[PDB]
Ligand binder design. Sequence first.
Ligand SMILES: C[n+]1cn([C@@H]2O[C@H](COP(=O)(O)OP(=O)(O)OP(=O)(O)O)[C@@H](O)[C@H]2O)c2nc(N)[nH]c(=O)c21
Ligand SMILES: O=C(O)/C(Cc1ccccc1[N+](=O)[O-])=N/Nc1nc(-c2ccc(Cl)c(Cl)c2)cs1
Length: 185
Amino acid sequence: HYIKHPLQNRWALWFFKNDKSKTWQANLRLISKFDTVEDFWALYNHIQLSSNLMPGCDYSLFKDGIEPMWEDEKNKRGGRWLITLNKQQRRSDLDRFWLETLLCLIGESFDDYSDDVCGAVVNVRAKGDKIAIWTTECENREAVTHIGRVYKERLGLPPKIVIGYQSHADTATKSGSTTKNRFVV
Ligand SMILES: C[n+]1cn([C@@H]2O[C@H](COP(=O)(O)OP(=O)(O)OP(=O)(O)O)[C@@H](O)[C@H]2O)c2nc(N)[nH]c(=O)c21
Ligand SMILES: O=C(O)/C(Cc1ccccc1[N+](=O)[O-])=N/Nc1nc(-c2ccc(Cl)c(Cl)c2)cs1
């Protein structure tokens, strides 16, 4: 006898293929959804086993009903904690960071503040990979800084590695690199 183990939330995995030729929204595809521990690992292990990372090919895991874009009702007033990797952290750090990020989400690692979490995004870029946790209200200093503190600790980043929280509204009018931060941790 084998019972499945429900997650607190249902999650959706999205794929994105970079192409500045086409409008941004056109490059997004919903892969599948899951709401159990078993189904999470089945999907995670399948991607690790049968797929290869590719520059310009992003994955996003968001709560059911939240599209992984600024436009979404649940993201428009929100923002993200951004982790920027060096080019050499691609190997033997990116995979660890991403899985640890996924587990923060589905395990609701931020306690009552996990409610403010929308999802997470990994960008694979030759310029340097990026991982981010998106939250729903960029002005909720309490929730945002708590999520940031726990997230940084969970990833084991050295204290002198300062990570920043960007409002999506600011990002939309500049760039994730030149976008100034609302908070640091
Ligand atoms: C997350 N996101 C990104 N874009 C567009 O895609 C561009 C690249 O966004 P990016 O997140 O892929 O970062 P990248 O490393 O490619 O480059 P940089 O951040 O500019 O340094 C952005 O400049 C936006 O124009 C977006 N456009 C819309 N409409 N909605 C979104 O959520 C969104
Ligand atoms: O043109 C492409 O390169 C495409 C198609 C695409 C996709 C989105 C936007 C545009 C386009 N396009 O241009 O046609 N690649 N699609 C991919 N899917 C996976 C992929 C999905 C799901 C799981 Cl479970 C796994 Cl293991 C791999 C890896 S790559």
